[PDB]
DNA sequence: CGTCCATGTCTACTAGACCTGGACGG
């Protein structure tokens, strides 16, 4: 549900749909409070890309498709249990809340957005979310400048382990990555964000790791897109011998050693 | 049977609220 997972999900969509053609309507579960998706087309291809903790599907009618349709984009957020699956049409998983149906020649499939807890959301419009910062995986430099122009923001008054969840500046970082990131620089989680960030501009540093650590996870591959590969990679989050505490917002921060000055 | 825990926002009056379910304890 963090940046590398969204990025793996979009490569999953792209590779698995490379040679598929979809058709029909875009079907939503009756229980989902997300919008219905007005799209019909006898023949359309699907593609994706990711930005931080969001992923964008593009629906692309082939030439001559009927209903006339222009290409349509949808932006998804995954929450705690979102994912994308390619399953046979009649063996839908439980909680498949939005579904795209392959059209005939071959075996009838469904691409499903699958979300157990329903924390995920989508939106009509292909637009990214407007306050989100740039992607720590795909827009590093921009990510880095956005953080450094804006240290005056009161976001940086908070402890570093909290500011790292703030998607206005660290679009893509979630609770496992903050544990792992901090742990590699041995920065106490409750050190103050502005201090750890001045001392950078204005041996990789904290912002550099915000890119390279989640990039590591992407390079392990997998995740539905093999889970022991990841549990093996983890050095801190959930690990035996690590301390942990609750931040302001009730989220568990895992670490080693000094909790830091702003601890609760 | 029950309590606690989980890769996130979202919304409204920080502190719940939103949700299912697996692990574990009695």
CSV table of C-alpha atoms (C1' of nucleotides) in Angstrom, one decimal:
chain,number,residue,atom,x,y,z
A,1,UNK,CA,0.0,0.0,0.0
A,2,UNK,CA,3.1,2.3,-0.1
A,3,UNK,CA,4.8,3.7,-3.1
A,4,UNK,CA,6.7,0.7,-4.3
A,5,UNK,CA,3.5,-1.4,-4.1
A,6,UNK,CA,1.6,1.1,-6.3
A,7,UNK,CA,4.5,1.1,-8.7
A,8,UNK,CA,4.5,-2.7,-8.8
A,9,UNK,CA,0.7,-2.6,-9.3
A,10,UNK,CA,1.0,-0.4,-12.3
A,11,UNK,CA,3.7,-2.5,-13.9
A,12,UNK,CA,1.4,-5.4,-13.2
A,13,UNK,CA,-1.4,-3.8,-15.0
A,14,UNK,CA,0.8,-2.9,-17.9
A,15,UNK,CA,2.4,-6.3,-18.4
A,16,UNK,CA,-0.6,-8.4,-17.8
A,17,UNK,CA,-2.7,-6.3,-20.2
A,18,UNK,CA,-0.2,-5.9,-22.8
A,19,UNK,CA,-1.9,-8.3,-25.1
A,20,UNK,CA,-5.5,-8.0,-23.9
A,21,UNK,CA,-8.4,-6.3,-25.3
A,22,UNK,CA,-11.3,-5.2,-23.1
A,23,UNK,CA,-14.8,-4.4,-24.0
A,24,UNK,CA,-18.1,-3.6,-22.4
A,25,UNK,CA,-18.8,-1.5,-19.4
A,26,UNK,CA,-16.7,-0.9,-16.2
A,27,UNK,CA,-18.5,-2.7,-13.4
A,28,UNK,CA,-18.6,-1.6,-9.8
A,29,UNK,CA,-19.7,-3.6,-6.7
A,30,UNK,CA,-23.0,-2.4,-5.2
A,31,UNK,CA,-21.4,-2.0,-1.8
A,32,UNK,CA,-18.7,0.5,-2.9
A,33,UNK,CA,-19.3,4.2,-2.1
A,34,UNK,CA,-16.9,5.2,-5.0
A,35,UNK,CA,-18.3,6.6,-8.2
A,36,UNK,CA,-19.6,4.6,-11.0
A,37,UNK,CA,-17.4,4.8,-14.0
A,38,UNK,CA,-19.2,5.9,-17.2
A,39,UNK,CA,-17.3,4.1,-19.8
A,40,UNK,CA,-18.4,1.7,-22.5
A,41,UNK,CA,-16.4,0.6,-25.6
A,42,UNK,CA,-16.5,-2.6,-27.7
A,43,UNK,CA,-12.6,-2.6,-27.8
A,44,UNK,CA,-10.2,-1.0,-25.4
A,45,UNK,CA,-6.7,-1.5,-24.0
A,46,UNK,CA,-5.7,-0.6,-20.5
A,47,UNK,CA,-2.4,0.9,-19.2
A,48,UNK,CA,-1.1,2.4,-16.0
A,49,UNK,CA,1.4,4.5,-14.3
A,50,UNK,CA,2.1,5.4,-10.7
A,51,UNK,CA,2.9,8.5,-8.8
A,52,UNK,CA,3.6,8.2,-5.2
A,53,UNK,CA,0.8,6.5,-3.4
A,54,UNK,CA,-1.6,6.9,-6.4
A,55,UNK,CA,-1.9,5.0,-9.7
A,56,UNK,CA,-3.5,6.1,-12.9
A,57,UNK,CA,-5.3,3.7,-15.2
A,58,UNK,CA,-5.8,4.8,-18.8
A,59,UNK,CA,-8.7,3.2,-20.9
A,60,UNK,CA,-8.0,3.4,-24.6
A,61,UNK,CA,-10.6,2.4,-27.2
A,62,UNK,CA,-9.0,0.9,-30.3
A,63,UNK,CA,-9.7,2.6,-33.7
A,64,UNK,CA,-13.3,2.1,-34.7
A,65,UNK,CA,-14.5,1.1,-31.3
A,66,UNK,CA,-18.2,1.6,-30.6
A,67,UNK,CA,-19.9,3.9,-28.5
A,68,UNK,CA,-17.6,6.5,-29.6
A,69,UNK,CA,-15.3,7.1,-26.7
A,70,UNK,CA,-12.3,9.3,-26.0
A,71,UNK,CA,-9.6,7.8,-23.8
A,72,UNK,CA,-10.5,7.8,-20.1
A,73,UNK,CA,-8.3,8.1,-17.0
A,74,UNK,CA,-9.0,7.0,-13.5
A,75,UNK,CA,-6.9,7.7,-10.4
A,76,UNK,CA,-6.8,5.2,-7.6
A,77,UNK,CA,-5.6,5.3,-4.0
A,78,UNK,CA,-5.2,1.9,-2.3
A,79,UNK,CA,-5.7,2.5,1.4
A,80,UNK,CA,-4.7,-0.4,3.6
A,81,UNK,CA,-5.8,-3.3,1.4
A,82,UNK,CA,-6.1,-2.2,-2.2
A,83,UNK,CA,-4.7,-4.3,-5.1
A,84,UNK,CA,-5.2,-5.2,-8.7
A,85,UNK,CA,-5.8,-8.8,-9.8
A,86,UNK,CA,-6.3,-10.5,-13.1
A,87,UNK,CA,-8.7,-13.4,-12.6
A,88,UNK,CA,-11.0,-15.5,-14.6
A,89,UNK,CA,-14.4,-13.7,-15.1
A,90,UNK,CA,-16.4,-16.2,-13.1
A,91,UNK,CA,-13.9,-16.6,-10.3
A,92,UNK,CA,-13.9,-13.0,-9.0
A,93,UNK,CA,-12.3,-12.6,-5.7
A,94,UNK,CA,-14.3,-11.5,-2.7
A,95,UNK,CA,-14.2,-7.6,-2.5
A,96,UNK,CA,-13.5,-7.0,-6.2
A,97,UNK,CA,-15.0,-3.6,-6.3
A,98,UNK,CA,-14.3,-2.5,-9.8
A,99,UNK,CA,-13.8,-4.6,-12.8
A,100,UNK,CA,-12.8,-4.5,-16.4
A,101,UNK,CA,-13.8,-7.4,-18.6
A,102,UNK,CA,-11.7,-8.8,-21.4
A,103,UNK,CA,-13.5,-9.1,-24.7
A,104,UNK,CA,-13.5,-12.2,-26.9
A,105,UNK,CA,-11.2,-14.0,-28.7
A,106,UNK,CA,-9.4,-15.9,-25.8
A,107,UNK,CA,-10.3,-16.9,-22.2
A,108,UNK,CA,-12.8,-14.4,-20.5
A,109,UNK,CA,-10.8,-12.5,-17.8
A,110,UNK,CA,-11.5,-9.7,-15.4
A,111,UNK,CA,-9.0,-7.0,-14.2
A,112,UNK,CA,-10.3,-6.2,-10.7
A,113,UNK,CA,-9.5,-3.5,-8.2
A,114,UNK,CA,-9.7,-5.6,-5.0
A,115,UNK,CA,-10.0,-3.9,-1.7
A,116,UNK,CA,-11.0,-5.7,1.5
A,117,UNK,CA,-11.3,-2.8,4.0
A,118,UNK,CA,-12.6,-0.3,1.4
A,119,UNK,CA,-10.1,2.4,2.5
A,120,UNK,CA,-9.1,2.9,-1.1
A,121,UNK,CA,-10.8,5.4,-3.3
A,122,UNK,CA,-11.0,6.4,-6.9
A,123,UNK,CA,-12.0,9.4,-8.9
A,124,UNK,CA,-13.2,10.4,-12.3
A,125,UNK,CA,-10.7,12.6,-13.9
A,126,UNK,CA,-7.2,11.4,-14.5
A,127,UNK,CA,-5.8,14.1,-12.2
A,128,UNK,CA,-3.3,13.5,-9.4
A,129,UNK,CA,-4.3,14.6,-6.0
A,130,UNK,CA,-3.7,18.3,-5.8
A,131,UNK,CA,-1.6,18.7,-2.6
A,132,UNK,CA,0.5,15.6,-3.2
A,133,UNK,CA,4.2,16.2,-3.5
A,134,UNK,CA,6.2,14.6,-6.3
A,135,UNK,CA,6.9,11.0,-6.5
A,136,UNK,CA,9.9,9.9,-4.4
A,137,UNK,CA,10.5,7.1,-6.9
A,138,UNK,CA,9.9,8.8,-10.2
A,139,UNK,CA,10.5,12.5,-9.6
A,140,UNK,CA,13.4,12.4,-7.1
A,141,UNK,CA,14.9,15.7,-7.9
A,142,UNK,CA,11.6,17.5,-7.8
A,143,UNK,CA,10.7,15.7,-4.6
A,144,UNK,CA,14.0,16.8,-3.1
A,145,UNK,CA,13.5,20.5,-4.1
A,146,UNK,CA,10.0,20.6,-2.9
A,147,UNK,CA,11.1,19.5,0.5
A,148,UNK,CA,14.0,22.0,0.7
A,149,UNK,CA,12.2,25.2,-0.5
A,150,UNK,CA,9.6,24.5,2.2
A,151,UNK,CA,11.2,23.7,5.5
A,152,UNK,CA,9.5,26.8,7.0
A,153,UNK,CA,6.2,24.9,6.8
A,154,UNK,CA,4.9,23.9,10.1
A,155,UNK,CA,4.9,20.4,8.9
A,156,UNK,CA,8.5,20.4,9.7
A,157,UNK,CA,7.9,21.4,13.3
A,158,UNK,CA,6.7,17.8,13.8
A,159,UNK,CA,9.0,14.9,14.6
A,160,UNK,CA,10.7,13.4,11.6
A,161,UNK,CA,8.9,10.1,11.9
A,162,UNK,CA,5.6,12.0,11.4
A,163,UNK,CA,6.6,14.5,8.7
A,164,UNK,CA,7.7,11.4,6.7
A,165,UNK,CA,4.1,10.3,6.4
A,166,UNK,CA,3.0,13.7,5.1
A,167,UNK,CA,2.1,13.1,1.5
A,168,UNK,CA,2.4,16.7,0.6
A,169,UNK,CA,6.3,16.3,0.8
A,170,UNK,CA,6.9,12.6,0.9
A,171,UNK,CA,4.3,11.2,-1.6
A,172,UNK,CA,4.9,7.5,-1.4
A,173,UNK,CA,6.3,7.0,2.0
A,174,UNK,CA,4.2,5.1,4.5
A,175,UNK,CA,4.7,3.4,7.8
A,176,UNK,CA,7.0,0.6,6.8
A,177,UNK,CA,9.3,2.8,4.7
A,178,UNK,CA,9.7,5.4,7.5
A,179,UNK,CA,10.9,2.7,9.9
A,180,UNK,CA,13.3,1.4,7.3
A,181,UNK,CA,14.5,4.8,6.2
A,182,UNK,CA,15.2,6.2,9.7
A,183,UNK,CA,16.8,3.0,10.7
A,184,UNK,CA,19.5,3.2,8.0
A,185,UNK,CA,20.6,6.7,9.2
A,186,UNK,CA,20.1,5.9,12.9
A,187,UNK,CA,18.1,9.1,13.2
A,188,UNK,CA,15.8,9.0,16.2
A,189,UNK,CA,12.3,8.9,15.1
A,190,UNK,CA,11.3,11.8,17.3
A,191,UNK,CA,14.1,14.1,16.4
A,192,UNK,CA,12.7,17.2,14.9
A,193,UNK,CA,12.1,17.3,11.2
A,194,UNK,CA,13.4,20.7,10.5
A,195,UNK,CA,16.7,19.9,12.3
A,196,UNK,CA,17.4,16.8,10.4
A,197,UNK,CA,16.6,18.6,7.1
A,198,UNK,CA,18.7,21.8,7.6
A,199,UNK,CA,22.1,19.8,8.0
A,200,UNK,CA,21.1,18.7,4.6
A,201,UNK,CA,21.2,21.4,2.1
A,202,UNK,CA,19.6,24.7,3.2
A,203,UNK,CA,27.0,8.5,3.1
A,204,UNK,CA,23.6,9.0,1.4
A,205,UNK,CA,21.4,11.5,3.2
A,206,UNK,CA,17.8,11.3,4.4
A,207,UNK,CA,16.2,12.7,1.3
A,208,UNK,CA,18.4,10.4,-0.9
A,209,UNK,CA,17.2,7.4,1.0
A,210,UNK,CA,13.6,8.4,0.5
A,211,UNK,CA,14.2,7.5,-3.1
A,212,UNK,CA,16.7,4.7,-2.9
A,213,UNK,CA,15.1,2.7,-0.1
A,214,UNK,CA,11.7,2.3,-1.8
A,215,UNK,CA,13.5,1.8,-5.1
A,216,UNK,CA,15.1,-1.3,-3.4
A,217,UNK,CA,11.7,-2.8,-2.7
A,218,UNK,CA,10.7,-2.2,-6.3
A,219,UNK,CA,13.8,-4.1,-7.4
A,220,UNK,CA,12.9,-7.1,-5.2
A,221,UNK,CA,9.8,-7.2,-7.4
A,222,UNK,CA,6.9,-9.5,-6.4
A,223,UNK,CA,4.1,-8.6,-3.9
A,224,UNK,CA,1.3,-10.1,-6.3
A,225,UNK,CA,3.1,-8.4,-9.2
A,226,UNK,CA,7.8,-13.8,-2.8
A,227,UNK,CA,6.5,-12.2,0.4
A,228,UNK,CA,9.4,-13.8,2.3
A,229,UNK,CA,11.7,-11.9,-0.1
A,230,UNK,CA,10.3,-8.8,1.5
A,231,UNK,CA,10.1,-10.0,5.1
A,232,UNK,CA,13.9,-10.8,4.5
A,233,UNK,CA,14.6,-7.3,3.2
A,234,UNK,CA,13.0,-5.6,6.2
A,235,UNK,CA,15.6,-4.6,8.8
A,236,UNK,CA,13.4,-2.8,11.3
A,237,UNK,CA,9.7,-2.6,10.7
A,238,UNK,CA,8.2,-5.3,13.0
A,239,UNK,CA,11.5,-6.9,13.7
A,240,UNK,CA,12.5,-8.7,17.0
A,241,UNK,CA,14.7,-6.5,19.2
A,242,UNK,CA,13.3,-3.2,17.9
A,243,UNK,CA,11.6,-0.7,20.0
A,244,UNK,CA,8.3,0.9,18.9
A,245,UNK,CA,6.1,3.7,19.9
A,246,UNK,CA,2.9,5.5,18.9
A,247,UNK,CA,3.1,8.8,17.1
A,248,UNK,CA,0.6,11.7,17.5
A,249,UNK,CA,-1.7,9.9,15.2
A,250,UNK,CA,-1.7,6.5,16.7
A,251,UNK,CA,0.6,4.9,14.2
A,252,UNK,CA,3.4,2.6,15.3
A,253,UNK,CA,6.9,3.7,14.5
A,254,UNK,CA,9.6,1.0,14.7
A,255,UNK,CA,13.2,1.8,15.6
A,256,UNK,CA,16.4,1.2,17.4
A,257,UNK,CA,17.8,3.1,20.3
A,258,UNK,CA,17.2,6.7,21.1
A,259,UNK,CA,13.6,7.6,20.7
A,260,UNK,CA,14.5,11.2,20.3
A,261,UNK,CA,13.8,14.6,21.9
A,262,UNK,CA,10.1,15.0,20.9
A,263,UNK,CA,9.0,11.5,22.1
A,264,UNK,CA,5.5,11.2,23.8
B,1,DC,C1',-16.4,-16.4,22.3
B,2,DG,C1',-13.6,-12.1,22.7
B,3,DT,C1',-9.3,-8.3,22.2
B,4,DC,C1',-5.7,-6.4,19.3
B,5,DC,C1',-3.4,-5.5,15.2
B,6,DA,C1',-2.6,-4.1,10.2
B,7,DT,C1',1.9,-1.2,4.0
B,8,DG,C1',-4.1,5.2,4.9
B,9,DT,C1',-6.4,8.8,4.5
B,10,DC,C1',-10.8,11.7,5.5
B,11,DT,C1',-13.7,14.6,8.0
B,12,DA,C1',-15.8,16.8,11.5
B,13,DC,C1',-16.5,18.6,16.0
B,14,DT,C1',-6.5,16.1,18.1
B,15,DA,C1',-10.1,12.2,17.8
B,16,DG,C1',-12.8,9.3,16.0
B,17,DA,C1',-14.6,7.1,11.5
B,18,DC,C1',-14.2,4.3,7.8
B,19,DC,C1',-13.7,-1.5,7.1
B,20,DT,C1',-12.5,-6.7,7.0
B,21,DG,C1',-10.1,-10.3,9.0
B,22,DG,C1',-6.1,-12.9,11.0
B,23,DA,C1',-3.6,-14.0,15.1
B,24,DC,C1',-4.1,-14.9,19.6
B,25,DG,C1',-6.1,-15.5,24.3
B,26,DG,C1',-9.9,-17.6,27.6
